From a paper:
The cytochrome c maturation system I, consisting of eight membrane proteins (CcmABCDEFGH), results in the attachment of heme to cysteine residues of cytochrome c proteins. CcmABCD represents an ABC transporter complex using the energy of ATP hydrolysis for the transfer of heme from one binding partner (CcmC) to another (CcmE). Our cryo-EM structures reveal that CcmA2B2 form a homodimer which is an ABC transporter analog. CcmC which harbors the heme-binding site is attached to two CcmBs with two coupling helices TM4 and TM5 on CcmC, respectively.
A conformation with only one ATP bound, near CcmC, exhibits a “semi-open” inward-facing conformation. In this semi-open state, heme is loosely associated in the CcmC binding site and does not form a coordination bond with P-His1. In a second conformation with heme, in a semi-open NBD state, P-His1 is not an axial ligand, for the distance between heme iron and P-His1 is 4.4 Å and the angle between the line of P-His1 N(δ)–heme iron and the heme plane is ~50°. In both conformations with heme, P-His2 is not a ligand and the entire P-His2 loop is located near the CcmC:B interface. CcmC has a hydrophobic tryptophan-rich motif (WWD domain) of which at least two tryptophan residues W114C and W119C are in close contact with the heme in both heme-bound conformations. The semi-open NBD state shows a similar but smaller conformational change as the open NBD state. We propose that we have trapped heme in conformations whereby the CcmABCD cycle of ATP hydrolysis weakens interactions with heme leading towards release.
Author numbering:
A (entry chain B), E (entry chain F): 1 to 220
B (entry chain C): 7 to 237
C (entry chain A), F (entry chain E): -1 to 200
D (entry chain D): 1 to 55
Write the structure that this text describes.
């Protein structure tokens, strides 16, 4: 109830001080800088391997931040939402997922101008990387929300349970890499962005429903 | 004959005016005697004036990391409570110095490389030092309970300082494997030495100012509940 | 006709069924308490009444209609605090209640905190409360909420007797007006027996 | 008594590479003043921070 | 009370903790598969970027595997070793971190031959693979132990750990990737091997004492 | 005489002063219990006795030596069971306690646990055992340890009186030979009142 005050709540719980907001920024920066230490300093090498670097960093951030989205609540705050808030469970879980993005995607997007200069990306490359990144990163919380809830709240879970979390994100990253490679080659990519645009408008509609049902089943 | 009581708050109060005004005077004399009263090199042209503004930041980054090392070393083995507090006082000052050195080095290198980013030993090392800083700040801000952030922070500082020369010599050796050497030798020239040293001292003394203010703030934040703070 | 009604509830854990075929209807103005003990059915009996879990065989109808069918007119009249109060430990006591309250006008939030024994603990983070005041924050809602239903587990698990006493006398108060009180207490209640209707897991 | 510039901002503020040097000056002055004002203001807030605690 | 006793019992409880130890392994597999799939059919660049991608994979897998090192000890059994076992605490930490390597580092070692087939390395390539991984992963665990020892009290498993120890691992990464690059050129790598061994020996002594002090602080 | 003794011990947590300048002799042949309220730092006190926590000021001496100096031989004579049991949950009972056996294991384990009341549960992992029985496995170390110091932190949380009396006898049959049982409890001990030397957080 009052979607935005929930939003303010999970804004407050995750962050404690004005100094510690940029923690995901520092994670992104160290993950990116790990590669030129190992791959090499040559720009052309680092130029062409940009998509893997950037979306691997995004994948790491998403996986690290999804565990905290649900596992901690099991001990203390998993309920009081399935049990209160007469508003539909899809609404509150959508709030959780979108704030999960806005504490991870927003730092990554706002950091994109810097990282593109580290890897030698050009303005067109930065533009396509930013527009795809803002178009695909929110989805990472969408499909990951049902998977993480089961793996952190279902006991006697086998190895096959994690297959609904990590490998389901492969299509997103492969389309992202292919699209921004095509853009890096200086080609129009609008059709690829439409595919990303199509999946974002579609997954956002069905993700909260399945996630709410998954939490309902998992708490029992 | 150390006392180290909360009376050190008064000790900090007894230094801020004098040392701060001395710092501002030396900085302004360095930056007017530099940045407009000294010539430049033949090759880089007038852009060489970044030295007065770029080198001291880098030098004092390492200097106050050594200060971190000595303060935490005192605070751990002797169990000095305030000595562990010095880490948080100098942490964001270090972060700012190293960030400034990074941005200047990147900005100074634009005319000679043509690009805003060059993965050289000097810049890359500064990135790792900044990372050690921001790790220290993050660790200290992670603890809700004080009196712990400063002991764990001290251990982190010790781990950093032990590994720091190894990392720096590795990245220096890493650069040799790919490119081979630096651009050109180091020539300060007598006509361009005194202003640089005076700027070094000015950054020293402004760092001292900021460390003292942060010590005073941390003293208040820690001993916030004792009736000593009734004022 | 009337609010939540049990309808041959059946549930089971491991090899021992906690109960069998509960069907009891409750109307307005009842203070009631579950007897027996709390081994497994502690949360089980209450969660099924709230619709949090689905029954192995049975159902409960709120106001004559299924709980999951509406899911709206039932949640609006309900409060619950149990083994885990469901309030986040990060926030302070004052702000944590503000979201829970329907608007958080702040003109009465501290009043609830004051009447809950949490005088002056408004701006302190709730994690800094020593051992029991955290439940007091959850119990502070009951001064402000307009809901007519209360499902509560271990409401006096670590509450002091004076804190317990204030909680008890408020429960009988609204039951006189329109309310209902169900409690699962190991500590005996210091109230007249006629004001409590007792039932166990059978 | 010996300036290194023949004249003022007609000659000064344009060293041929003025764009690089001046952005460096600003981007260095900002962090120092930000730290100073942050420390002083946060100390001042602590000083008020006692006040509402005394109530 | 003896090194071997704590070693074997930590190993045993590691065997009982299946299905999350594979998560570093599954992550390693997926990350080493993205980049060859990210770049189309051109092997020369793949040979050039193979050491960097696989070693960053090794770092990330080490962090994910090390995240559990002290997680399930503070709530139950971080003590009983500071408090009991008159054997000095640094020895206990040493035994437990060797067990952690044995249950985590060794699976990486046995996973190399499949990786080499995928990445098209040669027999000398797999030899140096094993040599650097066998001398790199113990250093990873030894250097990562202080970070988890410090952050165990927080019980915030995620971004914070990944920035406290990962910057410490830079020289290991540089020397490992440089050795593996030089190996593909068929130059002798004995000196590089000696450098890696010296780094492991150096971190073999400081890390136990550092983690002992860190744990003693974190318990308080 | 005087193997356990603290010097002007005091600790400060936040605004509240738990205690100031604690100092008291603790020699062999005593049976010691700690009294206090649920907000008092009794748990903080006990953990401080075992050297896990560095005191805010003051110190404790083992036999007259600072604990960190004699940390090696100190762990020879001490047994500690806190609020957290300290036992591996996914590891079975018989082999969990097997760690704490210097010798005579795999056969002497059974006798002690059966007295605690875990006969027939030797080869079951902890996570399929009840919490009350779960505590007993940790307490089973009492019958087998040769340590002179038994430090129990609320060892009667959910333990049956038949177990409690059996446990109480165990620490009643240990101190007279020279043993020491530093205890904290909320149940009124059902033993001779002169056997308890009470200390409060003064
Ligand atoms: C272009 C980017 C540059 C960056 C990022 C940079 C950074 C640094 C760093 C990290 C140091 C510390 C060295 C030490 O403490 O031993 C330093 C000092 C110094 N730099 Fe640079 N520098 C740059 C350009 C240059 C150039 C082109 C020269 C040419 C001579 C130069 C000359 C010096 C000298 C003489 C020192 C003093 C060495 C010392 O104090 O030990 N710098 N600078
Ligand atoms: N991180 C902390 N954890 C626990 N107590 C803390 C902490 N920081 C400060 N304190 C204060 O120190 C005191 C220590 O009390 P302690 O935790 O021993 O209570 P306790 O007797 O263990 O409670 P219980 O009997 O319910 O276990 C508390 O009153 C608390 O207010
Ligand atoms: Mg306690």
């Amino acid at each position: 109830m009052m979607f935005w005050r929930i939003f303010r709540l999970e804004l407050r719980v995750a962050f404690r001080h004005s100094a510690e907001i940029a923690n995901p920024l520092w994670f992104f920066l160290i993950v990116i800088t790990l590669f030129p230490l190992s791959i090499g300093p040559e720009p052309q090498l680092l130029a062409r391997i940009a998509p893997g670097i950037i979306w691997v960093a995004a994948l790491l951030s998403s996986l690290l931040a999804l565990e905290r989205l649900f596992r901690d609540d099991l001990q203390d705050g998993s309920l009081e939402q399935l049990m209160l808030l007469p508003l539909p469970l899809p609404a509150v879980v959508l709030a959780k997922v979108m704030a999960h993005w806005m504490v991870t995607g927003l730092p990554l997007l706002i950091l994109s101008p810097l990282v593109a200069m580290l890897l030698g990306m050009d303005v067109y490359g930065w533009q396509v990387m930013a527009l795809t990144l803002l178009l695909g990163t929110p989805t990472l919380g969408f499909l990951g929300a049902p998977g993480v809830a089961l793996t952190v709240g279902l006991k006697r879970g086998g190895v096959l349970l994690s297959i609904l979390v990590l490998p389901l994100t492969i299509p997103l990253l492969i389309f992202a890499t292919a699209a921004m490679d095509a853009a890096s080659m200086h080609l129009p990519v609008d059709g690829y962005l439409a595919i990303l645009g199509a999946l974002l408008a579609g997954t956002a509609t069905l993700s909260p429903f399945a996630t709410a049902a998954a939490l309902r089943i998992s708490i029992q | 004959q150390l006392a180290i009581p909360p009376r050190l708050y008064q000790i900090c109060g007894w230094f801020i005016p004098w040392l701060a005004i001395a710092s501002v005077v030396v900085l302004t004399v360095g930056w007017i005697w530099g940045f407009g009263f000294a010539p430049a090199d033949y090759q880089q042209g007038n852009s060489y004036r970044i030295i007065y503004l770029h080198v001291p930041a880098a030098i004092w980054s390492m200097g106050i990391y050594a200060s971190m090392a000595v303060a935490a070393f005192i605070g751990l083995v002797w169990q000095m409570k305030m000595a562990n507090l010095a880490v948080a006082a100098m942490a964001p000052i270090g972060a700012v110095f190293t960030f400034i050195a990074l941005v200047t080095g990147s900005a100074w290198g634009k005319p000679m490389w043509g690009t805003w980013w060059v993965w050289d030993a000097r810049l890359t090392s500064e990135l790792v030092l900044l990372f050690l800083y921001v790790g220290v700040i993050a660790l200290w801000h992670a603890f809700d309970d004080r009196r712990l952030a400063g002991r764990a922070a001290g251990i982190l500082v010790l781990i950093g300082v032990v590994n720091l020369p190894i990392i720096h010599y590795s990245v220096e050796w890493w650069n040799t494997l790919h490119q081979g050497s630096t651009r050109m030798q180091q020539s300060i020239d007598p006509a361009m030495r005194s202003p640089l040293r005076w700027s070094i001292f000015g950054f020293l003394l402004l760092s001292a100012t900021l460390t003292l203010m942060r010590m005073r703030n941390l003293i208040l934040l820690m001993e916030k509940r004792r009736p000593w703070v009734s004022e | 006709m009337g609010m939540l009604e049990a309808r041959e509830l059946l549930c089971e854990r491991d090899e021992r069924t906690l109960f069998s075929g509960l069907s009891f209807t409750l109307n307005a103005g009842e203070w009631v308490q579950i007897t027996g003990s709390n081994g497994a059915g502690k949360t089980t009996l209450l969660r099924l009444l709230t619709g949090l879990s689905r029954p192995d065989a049975g159902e409960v109808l709120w106001q004559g209609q299924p709980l999951h069918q509406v899911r709206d007119s039932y949640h609006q009249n309900l409060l619950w605090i149990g083994h885990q109060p469901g309030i986040k430990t990060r926030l302070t006591a004052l702000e944590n209640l503000h979201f829970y309250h329907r608007d958080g006008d702040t003109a009465q939030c501290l009043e609830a905190l004051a009447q809950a024994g949490l005088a002056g603990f408004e701006d302190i983070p709730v994690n800094q409360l020593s051992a029991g005041q955290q439940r007091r924050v959850a119990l502070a809602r009951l001064w402000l909420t307009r809901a007519t239903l209360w499902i509560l587990d271990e409401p006096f698990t670590a509450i002091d007797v004076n804190g317990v006493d204030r909680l008890t006398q408020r429960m009988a108060q609204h039951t006189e007006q329109g309310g209902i009180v169900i409690l699962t207490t190991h500590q005996p209640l210091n109230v007249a027996e006629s004001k409590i209707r007792r039932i166990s897991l059978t | 008594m010996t300036p290194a510039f023949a004249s003022w901002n007609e000659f000064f503020a344009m060293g041929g590479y003025a764009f690089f040097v001046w952005l460096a000056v600003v981007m260095t002055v900002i962090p120092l003043v930000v730290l100073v004002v942050h420390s002083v203001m946060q100390h001042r807030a602590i000083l008020r921070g006692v006040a509402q605690q005394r109530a």
